[model samples]
Target chain A: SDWISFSHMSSDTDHFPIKSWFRCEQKAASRSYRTLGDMSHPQGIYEVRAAITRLISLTRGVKCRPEQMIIGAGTQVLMQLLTELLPKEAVYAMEEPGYRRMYQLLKNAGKQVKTIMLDEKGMSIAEITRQQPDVLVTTPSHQFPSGTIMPVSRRIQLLNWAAEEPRRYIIEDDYDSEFTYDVDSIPALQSLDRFQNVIYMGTFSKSLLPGLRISYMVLPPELLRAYKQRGYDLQTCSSLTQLTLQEFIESGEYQKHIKKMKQHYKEKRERLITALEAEFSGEVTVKGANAGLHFVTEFDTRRTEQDILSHAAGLQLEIFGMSRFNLKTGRPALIIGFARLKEEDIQEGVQRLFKAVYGH
Target chain B: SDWISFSHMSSDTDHFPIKSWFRCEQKAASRSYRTLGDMSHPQGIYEVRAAITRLISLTRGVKCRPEQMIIGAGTQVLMQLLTELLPKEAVYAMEEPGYRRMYQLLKNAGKQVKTIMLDEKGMSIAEITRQQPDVLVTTPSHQFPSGTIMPVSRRIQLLNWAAEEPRRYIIEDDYDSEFTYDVDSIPALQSLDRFQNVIYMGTFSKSLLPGLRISYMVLPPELLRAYKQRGYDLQTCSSLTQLTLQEFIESGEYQKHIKKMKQHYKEKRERLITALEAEFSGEVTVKGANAGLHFVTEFDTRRTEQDILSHAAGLQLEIFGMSRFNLKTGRPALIIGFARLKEEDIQEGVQRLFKAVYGH
Candidate 1:
């Protein structure tokens, strides 16, 4: 039996762009001595920040000042840093059924966290206005699980709401914004903000590799001031890794790799959807398929999520239940990640999934 | 004029065991595809943890279970994690003139922090017992700047005080434990703890390389349970770096490298001290020279630290004023780091410093 774990990207060793990365590593290793010193700057290496600024402009269409960017180990570490700028009892409004780990982190940091419900156009503007939380964290580019992209009008509303209150700010997590397959990626909310109220976050975890553990945040001028006032002495991420990534980005190899991965994942997504259509036409519906590594598939059957999950496990296929991401129980759906699976495996896996669910 | 930045370790890249590290990186890069999965475990890769446990036993003579270890981006990240386990208003007692960055991190995390003065024996036990803070952070192996090693008797006293109250705990920061130049290195405070109140913290920043940004913490059984209960879903450090370091250690290359570094540093330290004594005789006295990359030299002169620093700057010699590390105003002293300097460079730098201060 071919055991397929849908949550993880499959080990496509042959396709991994190791040649470019190895070349970068060798270059970085050779140059490590020159970079080894007391990293006096908290914002990270000058070269890396410049590289990141260029990448952001190319991908997100937002021009960021190197001074406004802060590099972190990942999103979690970035969240912790943001917490320092916030009041101990600051109210935070986040998307319901959004990134649960982020919600937990904010709550753990002693913030008063509330979940904002999302509609088809993304986080309800009405709910956000009613809450008027000091901080609002949203995945406007592509909502998690439900996969609703906030339209231009709603994003304008968000910017206006942030402007209404002096203390109010929006954390726009543009994670996986690069992977939208159906249409051209939307301009980042940060690009549209007249006032410096939007703090944009992006990560190399999705586009590059999670093992890099490199994520960055673009703080508004006001928040940047607050960050500088804190006077953090140490740089958290590895200087060597940061330097290597800087070199990779500057060499234009990073953009090339992203373009390559986008095409690769687009094909994988197409294959998975085609296989599903062939196996169970009109019986299943997929959402959030326009972007990212995974999508949610809702089934019109007399089976619970648990039953489907257990059956899939019996068939040696590991799939996630959408309810796991939900703060409140929603429709019974399966979240299948296709980024790691090969084209042939995608077809076979869907066939096995159908047989497991229907017992054919 | 030749420039010497005594504040930083001079790059010893020629002596670095790069061949072994490069091999490890190559092996890690080739196997990267296999490890690029959902890092399901928050404690980090089991193999890396197992390798760390073994390395600690062989080097520090203390045995730790892999379950007790948590990998972090660096010590600052680990300190933040420990803050979560403490009471929101938990009072913390830290060494006076200790790692200021750490103190700031705790304060920023909303902990009630205070400093306890350190004598030749290290943190004053009398002051600690009187204040009775919930947590105490100490650098037992080699006190920063002062270089005083806490005696075994003092370690027992501190441990006993921690055992007196269930909530009371000691954070043993053995950051430079492997770099002691004089005599056999003292056993870690954590190794002597019978009541399991010591939280042992160490980093590869000194012994291995600072650019790695890999640090580990050994949690006592109770704290470990609390950590597990939090259900932290993400590992902050890179899995590839961790795995590569594991292979480096398991292959005995790490031990060999440390051994080589220690010998190299030992020679550098002796040369530095010999130069200082030859230049000033009884006019200068050295302190904290038993271990680590740097030592403090107090001068019996009327000139202030700033005056000496300015003079050194004129000679293109960068050195730190010991007053920067002192919680209270102290005598005129300079902190010199020799780990990164060459033998000839060290002699010339000292000669330049003497010329700048006392004139040719």
Candidate 2:
């Protein structure tokens, strides 16, 4: 009767340090914070900005003053802001079979998004140059779904492409940059930007709690000036959380949390892969588990994606198909997410997936 | 040394019921919560929407199901979303001497905003009829700055204006509809909307705490359908706050909090007005105190807007001008916000205002 989901993008809450977080929250309710009402600056609280400035530098190796950061509730919220700030006629590009939520948000915001295909080192450089999008939105630190980290060479290539034109920019989404098990994670693409053409985004959803509803972006000087010129004066996040997070980071607790989560998730990833191999033996292969909570798993079978998905639905297991994320079907595999699982459920969860796949 | 700021729009944090709110926050972190990482529904937590639906009906006479509600961090964020949902050719109209923040936000979001004038009966229906904007943004229940409530007939007139056309819609900003000292509040324009052309907006900023950063919009069936078609997957509010707010509302603490704050604010409103009369005698006129924490005060003096503002600055006092909010200028006056003051400082605050004006 165990219903396991293999497509969860949320983290395990059982391990969250809620007591520590609440302490910070109470501390923030009465601190150097401005009044709870008019913390209404469009860019968000200055002190929180200062804290994130340091956290981002440590985690992603991006350098910026507090003034360059704009805090918001979701990555899409800030990215949409970037879309409007850039221009209407701008052509946008994203990784194919990339994160689909941002793609959908951008598309509905009336943005023209061209999905560039990916390689072993994340996004393809030649295709990006050929397509010539004004803004290249990439998950460089660890590619989502595919879970590939952009090598230094590809990063410099992307940054160089952005520097080639005045309006061209790269939106480096370091969403799950904190989790890397196989190798030392490279710094963000923005870190390699020489021409100030990188717009950086990161979130605590994977690293901490999604319910925290905090994500931010580091804008180049031009876009920061452009935003100021827009005179946008609405803060789109909780003042309490902003200040509390400020305390969490400044107290150096956030880094510890991320490091612990990375280790915890890495063990879970190995267990999941082991269980998959035990069930399918020589027919199943897992990749992309070296980074982030999710990875792509290839199953050697005569079954179509529809058959496996429907069978999983019957078993009360949620699993997503690779085709769901891609612009066209570049690959058809199972995108398995294991972050929300308990250690005990890692085996039982794989059993459920086995039953879903083979009608066991 | 008592520097009173009449320009402050934030509520007094000293009176905020922190103990009660924190209890709700603790209760939310564990119970009936999906993992903190995955409370990721774009429409927001279902339970919170249910609570807001009920609260809006009780306070503003709005009739909506939970699904119609879109929870967001700021009204501007949702308005920007609505702007995108509506086609690019859509023309928007708002009151001329309206909320400058929203006007500026709208203009930058790349929408054509036509400023319609207002009269004694809320927004001018005649001007609205002549202009025939696809969407009209209005603050009907106790208009901001002017603090005029729309009469029953005028509410229907505005509703009917939207009802006449297929694409025509009205955004009823029922901000501060809870506190009406002079008269029983009229139901929201959305309640009287028979054609489903009214989109309603409300916030907890003034009613509870501005730092709550939770604002919601009740979209019409059409807009709701449009949003669904767009397939938005971004949740832009704190899930913890949303659930805490849900528990707070379900337990009836939110209503009690609003009721207590209303009476307490009413007392402060009278004290500030009384102090103004004492200092300036018959030369001071106060309006818009019937509904919100702020009011417009006219002084019978020959001094320009700059003269008094600079004087206030010199005296370490802060107050805004009516000219700061208007399109061009309907009238130049002082817009004084008294929400962020101690009861003891009301008299001294007015004394500072007198000194700013008279150079005494």
Candidate 3:
């Protein structure tokens, strides 16, 4: 039998909205020659802008003007763009056990980056205030490894702090905000901010396919002005992909696909949770199961992360250790991703884990 | 009538290899679900790698290993990646009156970028050696704006200079190498370099379409290690586009398209040049007409660039002034492009320019 690796969360490709994309391609292929040749627009294709406006407004309830949006190849590229707009010696603060790649990206750009502590209610305001960074990067809707959905009051506090300083900004990385399972869907941090401090970053990689490489950033008016002033006007992503995605969203196919994927992911989530409960039965604790494709399971055993990793390897099961994401010491937790797994596979994998650990 | 703008060079969209792309798309769509889900490879798809190897080897006579290639969204992104691998205080040099955007890009990254002088041969070696930049960016085959092919001896001089210092490197931007009309195609500067000092960059923006936004870079072994050490492993371009391009190249359709486009462009070049000669009657001297979509024409008349531009505007014609690309004052030349225009359109545009400048 092949190894079942739960190291990363990838969208299930079996149910990709291929037919709608095909229809989009048909429409795109017949566009005027001028349209095909025009890569002059810095923001994006007008159709894509319209689609993004409608999608974000309908789902996230954030009314973003088209002019404020800049389309990038991915989140990393968008971060690079932001780095350009930021002051040369600007300091950045990020969640400690958050997306480590972003922290590295800012650090590489010569920005002074500090890690803010994450509590049960998301990022600690005290730590953030102590750092006093120019920019704050937060995943308020669904924090990465800890999976804490920040409350509205905490979000307001962050916004108020940002508004107090003219140069301060917040990067709201709303990565998996669409996949809330148990609780009511939380609105984006950008939606609640009245003072235009949030730079909302979103991606199609989670709901759609990562291979599309389509991501966007909603910048404040001043940042947009700064970007244009610096003469950063090149459209970096593929125009065909942008146009196809535009048609996909315009025809309401994107919404339909997201809805379908939500139900699909919900089922997978339920199955994985049930299997874990059956096997561990109060010996293990799960965090961040309410949303997103992954959750952290803490084993209340004497075994180290290495012990479970090596034992799981012997059983041909692969999983990630939570220590990889943490800057400091934390509990021995396993980051399990069930997004790419079928119900039966999830069940069998847990059973294999149970057998490997307990020698059943 | 609306203005016929010859200010910029764009590919002839009327003859795009759409049929071959459609075939490639069909094949790409049917790929295994697991392949689509797997975004594990940081460099790019393996099939694309193999195809790039074959394509460059056949066309440019450069035997590049598949492992040396790194796919990017465009050259700008590739430059950003290079900036990361380079030392923080690394001084960079580029051709003056060259790609302005590249100069700005390096400058924006806080690198000390100096512009080198360009003579009839190419970029001056004296200026480069004096500056002692860590990296030298040059378009050897078809230099931008000037369109001067760097001779082999000069290339050898550059290689010897780079071989003297381990930290020194050359960025060989082989853009529009295929469109050489008068001379037999010069092999890439990378092919001539004995030491592994050349970071070869290539783009499909001109040869295929700019809107695709697909480009590649070939890094030396040491530089590749440096890139990996910095944790810059994100694949930025669209995987779907990459896979489709692989199939297109593998099926030999890419070669066929290039062959067809060469002839198409050659004819347009001849028509535009003939019209210019017929209209101006040796009163104007043309430079860099041996290749590329655009060429420079220096008028002996007392008309300034602004005068010609204003007259052209009145005549519903659009053309660029050469002074915009100059680092120092020189001849008042007009940069005319004939890529996007048909034979009739080129003829009419030049006729209108002749009438506007000479007042019929």
Candidate 4:
């Protein structure tokens, strides 16, 4: 039996351009290495940090000082850092049906976790206002699981609420914010608010492929000073990966890769949809297909997702149940992928999935 | 007066053979990019875990499975992970005059932090037994500031105690475990413990370089399930760097590099001591010269370390204050770094430092 990984989009095969990556990595490895001396930020190498500065400006349109950006292994790690720095009882309001790993982080940190309800238009600002959590975690550009944009009005409301609270911080997680297709790029919440309450988080994982493990948080100036005093370990991500990514982005290679991957994903998405319709012989309720690496399809309960999944498994296909994505409601759904799947593979996988679900 | 960088080890100039690193990186990059769904071990990358498994065996003579190893950004990050996994309110007894960053990690984590007084023989086990701290943090290979190896007997005793106490755990940090020149590598405290309370933490920062941000901990079987259930985010360090280092180790490049660096550091150590005698009039007392990247030199109270530091700064020499390493009480001293300083630069920097201190 052939083993197929359908549940995950992260293909361990399609990695960063390693020759260029290691060329930069070897350059980073030769630098002076000294551990933390005294609960102080070590003298950091500028090349990689400078690269991050440039990459942020290019992708997000926000020019930030190197000091404003704190590098970590990824968004989740940075979240851990933020949770550590913030008050222990800090109330974290995460989007309902958002990333589970993120919710787990806040829960593990012993934060008061509240879920902000979502509607067709995305996160309900009214609900968020009612909760008035000390921290607001949201995916503004492209809502996870359900591809609904938190419209400009809601974004304004969030900023205004944060402005009023003064102490309340908005964690705008721009996950896959770089991959907006068919719509003009939505400006980040950070761009809307110059106030210190907005903590902007962006990751290289989605835009540059997920394995880079490089992410940047544009902290408010006040938070930057507080972070320095906290003296968190400076070395969180590999300098080599950061350096290579910097070179890749600065040399225009990363932008090119993104542009090509965007087109590739666009074509793959079309193929996945067409194949699903061709095989299913009925209308398929699909969501989140407009952006991101994954989309979900709602199916009849006659065949449970588990039963379909088991059948798909026999055919060497993998798909995640939507219940996995639902933090509040266990809606019967399948979270399918097309990101790393080849054009033909997506078509074939969708047909196989349909056959497994409803054999006609 | 000239301001020149005695530190010439920036990745910009000093680099390993890039072709080989690139070759390894290219093969790794093409393999696949890991993403959110990869189910990477609660520890970290599988290849890195395997490499660490071999590394522990080769360097420390510890027999352990790859599953026992857990990886993080660096030792401090691993320390935080350890604190979270271990029993709450567990006392952390760290070596006095140890890494201050570790102290911050424990204190900030709300663990009861106590200091275990140290001497040339390593952490005093009798003192540790009296305190009965649930978690004992020590630098056994070479004490952080004093650079004394915890003898084989002490290691056995510490591990034996850990075996006896169900609640207690030993955090043996082998940070500079690789650079010791005087004796064969000592077995880690984790190796002797039957109960798995010993968390053997190691890093590539000291041996390969700090920018790698790759460190691992080998947990006993008891902690593994809880850590895995916690389902920690494994994206703290770059998968790319971890893959490269894994390749570097598997290809024997890491071994070769370490052999070359050990020889180079030994020669530099000799040059630094000789230069100190000739240039500083042999008045400056040096400690921890047998291993690691630095040596501390005691300066007369009449000439404070700050005075010496300013002088060295004027000469563009990068040095740190040894007084900062003081956990309890110690003579005022300066940490002179000869790792990046060439033989001639060391001579000139020390000569300039001597003139700066006494010339006035």
Candidate 5:
């Protein structure tokens, strides 16, 4: 009773591969962990050199200093840093109904946060041009909730806008890029931006897992120096973990795991979509380009998101309500996630959801 | 110039025995490296469970909870947390000539911070009574710079005061308690103040090395709920490193390493003190009790700390001027660290300091 046990979500420790993790720990521990300074170095774990090296290699070494490349505990940590470094008067143009935690972080830091619209193609460039905010934060690789990928052309346009305007800053978060099931690995917005106004954030949370809390930011050289000064005392991520990640990636384990998991989740997505189409063909319209972990299915005006969520809960179904991500327009929708759910569990989950909506 | 010349520290790497650390990392990566849901589980790293459990067992199980234990990238990261959780109007009573970084953190947090006068017997309780601050931050085991330990009775009074005042909080930073040679292992503040008024902080910066960036706070039950709510989204320490640490301690490898290192440091401390007495004679006043990695030595106003530091640096001796950690009214001093220097290095270093003043 002390612990809040969600009906479907398992306790992380209960399901995490503990035995193999222990084996890996034993292997890493046997080696000297000192690379940063000593094990107790005030900066970070000496072991993070490996992880940073791997990250640089992943980004194709586009000229970055190690001091410039910070490994955060997670994106939330980095988000807080961004808020601190940017001007207090600066307005962050965030996607409406985006990641709630990010919104909270920005608000907590006393930044002027403005929400912009995101349609089928992702964050509307038209709305962005109108807003003319100092900083823009977007999940370009695979948009949260909607699962829309910002196309190559729009990515270029956003970059060009930053290049044209000297004061503009773009935070491109490629959070769940590793799980891009239907598309080729799209070029990052940072890669196209000419003025180097892009702050590209990549996290191991979606790919390797969240507990690792390893998130890297590729910042423009100018902002990098400022951030380093402000964040000197706040550097907390372990070098040992960074080193382990570098080894993990270099050994091809990360690539192999992503490939395998993508296939696994692809099948789950197919099953869920098929059942939903068969059950509520006329009532639902699924938005988003096919990619990432979750998909959004918008319902007609009669069916409210609250009704569906409570009805699903009645049947012990663990479906996400997309109303939380709703910015201005209160479009009722269900954000169904098929990543962690087992193949059979996905089928059963969708069937129960189908019963909750249609059978009722 | 690009490299810091790793050759000097290369030999120390060989001495580190990396295999034990690698094994630990391997085990952790296998279990914790794959869960996206593992972010900010409130109770930090499972491996910390074993590491801290053994640590607690070694320290005689001083009524600490693995659940209430919070791990951040470093002690500084937790300072941000403390700032957030503690009241804005709260009064922070710190050691007058203590660590400067704590002042920086509290000042940044907008807290009205005052200092308590520290004598040879640690923070003067009479000074605390005069100040009567809401929260007291003290390095009780071994005060910074001066290396003095608060006597048992002073500690009792501090605890008793916290017990009587419901609004009062005591933060006991046991930074380098492991190196307390010949002295009785001090009972942790948490052990004394069982009524949930004391917050205990420990760090691996001294014991495991500083670069690891892993430090923990043992929180009281009252503070736990607020911390969980406000800080669940904050970045946590690296999961891989924490996992590896768990295995390292579980295998008894860490205990063995600490035991050996303590003996090594003890001999170094003795050698430095013996050499200092022969070198400076009655001119230098050695302060602090038997414990800690560093000690303070006061000199006459005519000698000055600046003159001594410049002279020591000219001799290629890495040492700091003591004016940095001075009370409101005190004779100038120099803080000399013996742990990092070898016995021969200590002998040579002290002789240079001796002749700098005496020869002049």
Candidate 6:
């Protein structure tokens, strides 16, 4: 029998819009893909930025000129550029149990990266203020590990905190902002930002596919001017990828694929929820299941986090303990990722997980 | 009359093997492009590295396990990773009239960058010794702009220089390593590196298309350890592009296209030389025209470099002065680039450049 792994946060390429993507790729192959007959601006292909703007405006409620967008391979790639663009002495802060890669990059750059503690309402301005950092990197739409959506009050309070100190800025890593099953998709923290201090970041990795390596950040006026003035003009991402994606967006295929992919994940998420609920009515409690691909499931068991994980491993079932992403861990929980698994695999994985926990 | 410009260093994408590229791309679109059924190594897709190793061994006269290869978007992207992996205090030296983008990237990281001067045999060891730099970045196959192939004597000298100091290393940026018509292709500097101190870099931008944005670096054992220890496990290139390129290489289409593109550039190179000769027999002398896409043309006139460039601008012609790429002044000259222009445009650009230098 094959093992069921809940460790896959990777996109299910089975749901990828290959035919439409293929058509757009052909548009580049025939030499018809003119990046102004030579190359594109350092920000990216103008049309791709424009395409992203339309999609971004609808979902994030972030309506800025297309010129504000700077596209790269991912949030990590874009953040490297931001470090070069922003002040060298800028103190940065990120949520604890934060994005590990970003933390690595900032520390590698020798910046003083402060870790902000998370609360039920998400990272508090009071905690962030204690750190006194220049930049606040938050997952406001849906927090990474906890998946706690930042309420409107907290969002305004955080925005006002940045406004109070003009030197302060917020890097709203609006990752996984697209899908929300419980309510209408929450508007990005960038939308609530009145002072233009939010450096908004997003990726096609969630909506399209992870392997594409296309992500972008919208810079405020001064940062963009600084970017241009610094003359950092070498475009890094694949031009064919950019052009093909631009064509994908303009041809109406990108939006259609998103609709289909969201539905695909919705079915998978629902199955996982149902299977967990049926298997353990009061024994298992799902948290952060309102949105995103992976969700937290707390077990009402005396067993330790490692005890559950190790047992699952012995049973040839793969899943992660919450400690994997936490800078600090509090409780025994599991992160069941439903994105890469098939519909029935989700159900079987839950069953497998139960056996690992209680050997009946 | 429409003007012809000699400032095109861009790849002639019209000569891009669209049918072959399209075939490989299709191989990816059908869910057939499996990157080990999930993702690839941080280095790159294994097949892509294996494919690159096959090609690299034949021409560069260098051999290494595919595991030694680290693929990324371009040299700039890879160099950024190097800055992270290598010692921060490592002082770097490059050819004075070097690749500007590399200089910018190295400088942006606040690395102490030293510029070594070039002579008839390329960067001299005597001059490099004065700088006392840790790493030497050189285009030993064929120097950029100057196109001076570092003779075997200097190659040994440079390699020995790195070996002399335990901390010293050489970065061989084998840009435009292919397409040499005057003689057999020059072997890579890394080929002659007896000690594993040479970090080798190469790209598909010149051979295939710049728009692809696929570049790779070969790390020595110690540096490779550093890379792994740092855990730069994020893959930053397009999976489809890597898979497509691997398929293209495996299918033998890549080697075939390289053969064809070499012939294409050789013809363009010869035409530019012949036109320059016909226009000004004694008044114009071409330097470093034996290899690469662009070469130096010294105009025997009182006209300053800017005077010639300005006059060409008025004629709706866009050509560059040698000063554009140089750190110091020299005999008035122009860099006549033929890579982007058509065959006849090379002829007309010569005529336009002649008038710009000497009145029609």
> Cα RMSD (Å) per model?
2.1, 2.2, 2.2, 3.7, 5.7, 2.2
- Candidate 2, B114-180: lDDT as tens digits: 8888788988999987876888889888777777777888888888887777788888887777677
- Give a tens-digit lDDT track for model 5, residues A1-360: 111212212222333344544444444544644444544232333345445545544743334455556667777767776666666678888887687777766766666778888876678878888978889899888787677888888878777777786668889887777666666676677666667888877777766556667787767777766665642354566555655565566555566766677787677677867877876775778766377777777766555777767777777776677767654336667776665555555546666766666554
| Docking category of candidate 3 | medium
Note the Cα lDDT for every prediction shown: 0.79, 0.80, 0.81, 0.70, 0.67, 0.80
CAPRI accuracy category, model 1: medium
Q: Candidate 2 clashing pairs?
A: none
> lDDT per residue, candidate 3, B1-360, as tens digits?
567768656666778877778779778768644667667367777678778877887788776887888887788888888887877678899898788888877877778888998887798898888878888999888777887888998899889898998689899998777677766888899998777999999888887888888888999999888877766467888888888898888787888888887887787788788888998888878888777778878776456768778888898887788767753344467777777776668777888878767665
In order, the TM-score of chain B in each prediction is 0.94, 0.95, 0.95, 0.90, 0.89, 0.95
Lowest lDDT 10-residue stretch of candidate 5 chain B: B1-10
Chain A superposition TM-score per model = 0.95, 0.95, 0.94, 0.88, 0.86, 0.94
Tens-place lDDT digits, model 2, residues A1-360? 456668657577778787888888878766744476566467888988988888778777889998999988888788877887887889889898787777887776667888899999889988987887888888887787687778899888887778777888888888778788877867777877878888888888877788788899989888899888876567788788888898888877787788788788887888888888887775777877667788888775567788888888887787788877765333338888887777787677787777767777
Residue runs of model 3 more than 4 Å from their true location after superposition: A1-7, A301-303, A310-318, A328-331, A356-360, B1-8, B327-330
**Which residue pairs collide, candidate 1?**
A10-A340, B9-B340, B10-B340
Candidate 6, residue A218: Cα displacement in angstroms equals 0.8
> What level of docking quality does candidate 4 show?
acceptable
Superposed Cα deviation of residue B239, candidate 4 (Å):
3.1
Fnat, model by model in order, equals 0.40, 0.84, 0.65, 0.41, 0.58, 0.32
TM-score of chain A of 6: 0.94
Which DockQ value does candidate 1 get? 0.49
Of candidates 4 and 1, the better by TM-score: 1
Per-residue lDDT tens digits of candidate 1, residues A1-360? 578767634434456577787688778767766456445257788778888988888778876888899988788788888877765667999888777788777776667788899888899888877776888899888887677889999999888988887788899998868788877788899999888888899987777777778898999888888888776446778877787788788787888877887898898888888889888987988887888777878786567778778888888888788678755344577778875676667877988889767766
TM-score of each: 0.96, 0.95, 0.95, 0.89, 0.79, 0.95
Error of 5 at B334 (Å): 3.1
For candidate 4 chain B, the 10 contiguous residues with the lowest summed lDDT are B6-15
Against the native complex, each candidate's DockQ, computed on alpha carbons, is: 0.49, 0.67, 0.64, 0.37, 0.35, 0.48
